[PDB]
Design a binder for these strands. Sequence first.
RNA 1: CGGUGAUUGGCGCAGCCUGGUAGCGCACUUCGUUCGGGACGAAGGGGUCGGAGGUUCGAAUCCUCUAUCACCGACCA
RNA 2: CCGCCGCCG
RNA 3: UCCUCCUAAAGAGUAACGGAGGAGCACGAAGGUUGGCUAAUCCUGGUCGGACAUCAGGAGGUUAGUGCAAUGGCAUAAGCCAGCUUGACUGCGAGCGUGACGGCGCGAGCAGGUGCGAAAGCAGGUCAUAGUGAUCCGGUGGUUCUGAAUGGAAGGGCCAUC
RNA 4: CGACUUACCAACCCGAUGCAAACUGCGAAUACCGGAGAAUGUUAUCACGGGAGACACACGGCGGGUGCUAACGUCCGUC
Lengths: 84, 177, 50, 136, 149, 188
Amino acid sequence: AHKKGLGSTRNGRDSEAKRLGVKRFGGESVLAGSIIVRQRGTKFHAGANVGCGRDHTLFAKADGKVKFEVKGPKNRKFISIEAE
Amino acid sequence: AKLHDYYKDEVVKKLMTEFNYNSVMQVPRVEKITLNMGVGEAIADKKLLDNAAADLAAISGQKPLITKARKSVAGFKIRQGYPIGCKVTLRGERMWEFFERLITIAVPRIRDFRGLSAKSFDGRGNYSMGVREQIIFPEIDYDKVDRVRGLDITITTTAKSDEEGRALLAAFDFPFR
Amino acid sequence: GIREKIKLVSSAGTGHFYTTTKNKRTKPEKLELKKFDPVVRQHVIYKEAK
Amino acid sequence: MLQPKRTKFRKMHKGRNRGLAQGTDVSFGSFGLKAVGRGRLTARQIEAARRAMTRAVKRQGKIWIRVFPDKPITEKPLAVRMGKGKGNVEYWVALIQPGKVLYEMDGVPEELAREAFKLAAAKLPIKTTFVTKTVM
Amino acid sequence: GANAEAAKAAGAELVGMEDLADQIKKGEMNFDVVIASPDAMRVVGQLGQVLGPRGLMPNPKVGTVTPNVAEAVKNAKAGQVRYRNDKNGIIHTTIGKVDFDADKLKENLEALLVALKKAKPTQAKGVYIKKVSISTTMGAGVAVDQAGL
Amino acid sequence: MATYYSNDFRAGLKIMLDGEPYAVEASEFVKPGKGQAFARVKLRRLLTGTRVEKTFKSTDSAEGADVVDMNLTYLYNDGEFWHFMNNETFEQLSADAKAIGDNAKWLLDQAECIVTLWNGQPISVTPPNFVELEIVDTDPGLKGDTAGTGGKPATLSTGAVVKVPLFVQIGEVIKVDTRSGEYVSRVK
RNA sequence: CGGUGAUUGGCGCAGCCUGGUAGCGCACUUCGUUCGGGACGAAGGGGUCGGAGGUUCGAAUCCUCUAUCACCGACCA
RNA sequence: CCGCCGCCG
RNA sequence: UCCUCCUAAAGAGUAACGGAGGAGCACGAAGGUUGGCUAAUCCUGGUCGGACAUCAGGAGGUUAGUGCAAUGGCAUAAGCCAGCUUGACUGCGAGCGUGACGGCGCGAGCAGGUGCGAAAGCAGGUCAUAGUGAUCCGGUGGUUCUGAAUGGAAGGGCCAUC
RNA sequence: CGACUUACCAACCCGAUGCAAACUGCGAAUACCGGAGAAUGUUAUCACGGGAGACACACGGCGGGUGCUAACGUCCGUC
């Protein structure tokens, strides 16, 4: 049986997936220091009692419930904590 | 300061009746006079610009600000942030003094003089002329210069049209070719 | 590859040292930064070495 | 063959042909050719149905083409095993949903247009039908 | 540019451009050291070619002859910097200071010329680093020193 | 530290083996049925440097260092050793008589010559295509009989010798070529 | 079928590696030399890199797509 | 030293 | 091997010799902080001056820029400039995120010690994700921590690090 | 130094018409995470400790890559 030659493929490279996204959802009681949202850019901005790490990682700065807002003139999403 | 007091009560009364203004803040006054020197050929030496920047120290009464390049093109072999020109912006007290020295003892010294074109308006009322020598200004000693390249003078006013600003310069007699 | 490493020797009596990278073929002079010392607990100016 | 110029990428996925069409009504011309069967039309099939239709409307008039392929189809060469990458671009198809008007025409009688789309429907793999430009 | 008027505050007399290349063509020995900066390196490298270096006037990134720090070059280099030149043999003669200076400091200046010459261990040295080190005054004294102490 | 198997270096990629470091000029690739592939790599010597011919198989690799070739500027002569000069970083360099052999006559001053830089400092010096030179030891050439082409020998100021035509006798600067070493024209 | 390195002035070849410049040898044009021609001397012209698209301040160079033409050849049954 | 030939009646 | 997007089916994860691109760095300013600023490209007018130098005005709207691919992101600007500087600092770190694990990533705040700002405050690198490899062995510096009878040192240990 | 004539191609806009995994000014159904309550289920939950097996899967429905919208083909998700 005859067998012709076969080409090559330049593609075939992908990364380890970084597990980005929302970790704690809304109305969920968290401890202080818990990561809420891992994200590349600030899809979600930091609201009240929520900080912003160097990785744009929104982390909780107090205990209480995760709250999502649509605040601001630029209609952007903030994340706050009502202190419980 | 001579033709600044001439503007206050002779030129305003000339202009309040020709275009039916209803307030004294409606008349256009000249805001600034900007002197660019687009040297251009400073790609060879830096001291050609320093000779050219010293040429504005005699025409104006202050030091020019050199301008870095905005973009970088291929037709002129320039780069980003290069001193391709130097500018003089003069306003306040000496802008009446430079306009005193221009139209009286610098404009009639232009070689092959016929007059100034009234087509040099952008529709806003900001006149811009172009001079072609350094030897029309009395401060240049005719020996320190080594280039025919001159400069341009932009007279920026606070008008809205060309006819609104043509009668503004008409009181200073502005030779009007 | 190009950017080699240096050793910031403390000019005080201690033997503590920071290390960092400096491109020698661009700015060939030494670094005289001023950081914290965990031994003397002073703010001693550090000097460049190998 | 109606072929695009400097596309975004050379090759794309296969893609399903679900959903209905969007170009339901005839807008420009007086009469149209509405498709009923769910298939696809290669870039030769639009140009072959235009040669057998521009003649029978004798050349004065105006003919529209309401579709454009802009979808590459790959094809492996002769006697090539599976795998080893994606094939080469050969032709361009248009995913024709049911309810899509293919051609339009203005400046012809109804008898001449009826014997024109009949001479172009046989050049197409999909089942088409004759319609009329409805008001509003 | 501005460094032609900012290096004058460091103590240099004749600061400029290719007008100083006419002084090179005349062979003026009023200058001994040449210091430039990497924008007028097209002057010495194209006009002072032969006369600059059996002239031996230096313009190196090997040495610190041409930095872009031309304001703060000659605040100490015009004062106290003595330049190390090569010879065909083993010898590297330098210059000591005025006789009536602090002689305790000069013996540490000779001791801190050891750390400068051992700062480059060219890494292809032979048996010794320093064999004979003698500091003479001008033409009379002979003082044999040691390489270790 | 780099690695280059026989499917990698193809043209203008230096290799290092024992040494001296060589250079690939041109090569072919044969992938024959039953057996291992090879490559008729026509190498080029760099130091002496005439030629070497090897037929590398699929194994093995070779160290690639150094590659660096760049424009220099000759300006200095003293005893034996020579020097050059950069225009992109302005760094000094030292040359030897080993790097100048059968080339030291043509380059005179401020020439745009190139060298090959490898581990301190050169390997060889390549003179430019055209240099201007002057004859000082040349007879006052008569016309003669002469019935044809010729053409008198001229001893050059650098110690070389070229064949010049009749109209240049004493102190006439001329430009020639350095590939073959013949007269082409006179600068005016 | 695959893979790899080329195409640069009429022609043959550089330069690419490591980006700011397009050459060299003939051929060709004019003059001198000869009674004239060839050859030899003097002066000079000639293309802007197969085509297209990227990268970049800037591309003959660095990448990609086809077009064209050579060399490696279609292995175990 | 070098210096080739000069269309066919 | 690592990074961006799609395939991946609206949390995450998800394969193929599936479609596409990049990385094996750079920087002592391009970091920290304070203060100030807002583009691209066309249009008009204007010495040399032209499709494109700089100047003046408007339309226009972030289609610009971000040391470097790609998505996400940013006007309070992370985009640009300047003054002053080294927080690119030591010992920790409640907590969780992600991995079979080795590991990786975020971290309020405390203690000591600085920087800038009048002050509130911010800074344990750079807008973020690529710029990197486990151990063994071996080398340099420090620290009586051990040190084969004792007193030392050698060699080991800890820490910084090649 | 002045250019007029001008069956021919054509940008930015206006109006209409389509297309797209690597387009998004809109946007479900399900799935997913978090709380409360009712009924039900042999704690089906999680944390440890002992001992394994297994890491060649296959077919069909749905959603796809690839292949010729070929295969009882191949590669994933979910049942």
